[PDB]
C-alpha cells in the first residue's frame, strides 16, 4: 500500500442552469480530479472544487500546488501513515480542496485495498443520511417551483434557502413563501454567504421570527467581527460559519470569540482526516454541525455522505448533498441515487464509486 | 468481523515492591483482562485497571458492568462500527477502564482481521515514543538509586516524581538531589496527586524554580476550585490534568475554566476512539499533551504506545511506559523491551501482543 503517484487532473462539466449565491456563481464544475496510485495497482479518487470566492483557489492553481509540492512530498508514504501525510501537507498554508482531495484519495485506496468502504472505517455509526438542498437566488416564484418540484422528485424535506440578497425583503418573502406552501412538512434554514451587513441580517431573521429557521449560515462576513459577534449573541438558533472556518484553528478562534455557535463541516476543505478534527473539536467543546456543500459533484457527495454517515453528531442532521443533481452529466459509472429525501452511503469500498474512463476522456481539459 | 462474545476476566500479579504515590498505592496489578470474540475466530485484548482512588472503578465492579452492561448491549455489531459502540457505551455514565478496555480490545481485533497494526490505523506518524519512568514515594536517597539505576539499565532519560507530601521540602529536596546528580541530561517534572493545597504547591514550585521542571501535574486538587485556578495562573509552565480530565468534556471545563493549562492522555481511560477525540480536543484548543501511565501492566503500556505513536502531538514528548517493571510478572507471550530510552510500537497486526496461556490459568482468580 505504497503511494507511487498522485495525479491532478483538470476537467470541466457544464451545469445545466448556474447556482447564484451572494458570494459568487457557479456555471460548469471546473473542477480536479485526484488520483492517489499505490504498488498494488490500486487508484483512489477523490475532487477539489476550485472556490476564488471561497478559499482564493482556482482551477490552475490546485493542479500546481499538488504536481509541484504534494505529490513529491507525500510519495513513498503508505496509506496507513495519514499523520504522516498529514503533518507534511500542514507546512504548506491554505490550499484547503487540493489537501482534502488528496487525503479523501487515499482514504478511498485504503478502503479498496481492506475491502472496506471509508464510511465504516471512519466509524459506520449508520448507513444513510437525510438530504437537504440548497435553493440558488432566483425570481421568488421560480425558487418555491424549484422546491416544490425537488421535493416532490427526490423526496427532498430540507431545504437551506441562499440570501444576502437587497433589499432584504426579496429574500425574506421568498422564505415565507416557502412556509406557506409546504408548512411544518419541510425544514427550513438560511445562508446569505457574507452578503449582508449584520445590521441587515438581524433585520432580515427577525422578519421571519414566526418561519422555525433551524439555522442561520454566515449572514454577514465574520471579518466584520465586532457586528458580527453582536449579531451572533442575538439569535436564537445556532449561527453556522461556514467559509470563515476552514481549519480546527479557526473553529477555536471564531467559537471561543464568539462569531460562531454552530459548525458547518465540508468534506471538499477538510476531507477525512480533517472533518475528523473538525467534528472531534466541536463535539468537544459542544457545538452543533452540519455536513455542507461546496457545490460538489457527485465525487464530492460520495465524500460527504461517507464521512456523515460515520457519526452521530453529523448524521443527526440532514447533509447537503443534492446540488450536484444541477451538473448536466458527472464521471461516475453509475450515478449517486437520492430517493425518500435520503442518500446511503455506497456499499462498495473505500468510497465506493469508479470513473468512467470515456467521461473523463471526454470532459477533462489538460 | 462480527463480535460473537466479550468476556472480562479478573487476574492478579504482585508487584515486586510498591508503588505509592499521594492519592492511593498498589501492591498488586489486581486488573481484568477483556476480550473480545469475533466469528472468525479472532480475540482481541486489553486490560482495565481498578484505580479506586482514581476513578472509583474495582475490579469486580469492572467484571460486572461488562458482564452485565456492555457485552450484551454490543454482541452483534461488528469490528467496523465502533461509532455505534461508542454511543451504547455511552448511555452508561462513568466506568472509564471498562469502556476504554472494550474499545481497545475491539481494535485489537480490527487489526488482527486487517493484518494491520492498531499503530498505523490511528496514523502511523512513527513507530517509538521515548520513555517516562514515575518515580514513587520512598526516602530520598532510595528514589535517587532507583532513578539512577533506572537509567543505566533502560536508557531512560525522562523522570516524572511523585509528590504531594508534607511537609513539602521532603519532595523538593528529592527533585533537587535529582537535578544535581543528572545535570541537564535527564527531563524532569512532578505530579502531586491531588496532595497538595495550591497554597502549598506554589511555595514548592518556587522552590524548585531553579531545576528547569517541564510540567506540573496535579499538584493540588482539581476541586479545590478557585485556588486551582489561582495557581495554574501563576506557574509558568503547562499545568498537566490528569485525574480531573477523564472525559473530553471535562477537557473543556477545566481548560476554559483555568485548572489546566495541559492534558494528560491514558489509553486506559479513554482507549483509542476516545482518546483521538481527547488528542483532536487539545489539538484543536492548542494544548500540549502528555501520554501518560494509568500504572499500566504490559497490555495497557502496549496500548499507550500505540495511540502515543500514530500522532505527532503525542509522541513529541516522551511517554510514561515504563511502570510495569515493577510487576513481578506479567501475561504476554513476549515481554515489552525498553532499550536506548525508548519503547517500540510492537509490529505485529492489532496491538502486536498475545496471551500467554499457562500465565493466564496461573494469575486470574474466578
Ligand atoms: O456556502 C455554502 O454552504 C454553499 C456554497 C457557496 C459557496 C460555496 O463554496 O459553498
Ligand atoms: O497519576 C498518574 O499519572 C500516575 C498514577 C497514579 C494513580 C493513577 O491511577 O495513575
Ligand atoms: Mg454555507
Ligand atoms: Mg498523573
Redesign the interface.
Known sequence: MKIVAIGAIPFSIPYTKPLRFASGEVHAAEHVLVRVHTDDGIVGVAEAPPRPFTYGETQTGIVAVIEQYFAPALIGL?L?????A??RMARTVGNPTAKAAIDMAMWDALGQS?R?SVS??????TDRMRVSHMLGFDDPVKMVAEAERIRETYGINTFKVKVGRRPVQLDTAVVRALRERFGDAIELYVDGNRGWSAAESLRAMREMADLDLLFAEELCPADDVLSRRRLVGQLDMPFIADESVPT??D??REV?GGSATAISIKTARTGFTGS???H??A????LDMVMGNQIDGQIGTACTVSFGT???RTSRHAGELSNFLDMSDDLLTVPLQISDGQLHRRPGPGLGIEIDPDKLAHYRTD
Do not use: D, N, S
Open positions: 503508505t496507513t501513515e495519514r499523520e504522516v498529514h503533518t481492506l472496506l465504516e472505517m471512519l466509524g459506520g455509526y480546527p484553528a473553529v477555536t471561543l475528523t478534527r473538525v472531534h473539536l463535539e468537544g467543546l459542544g460515520a457519526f452521530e
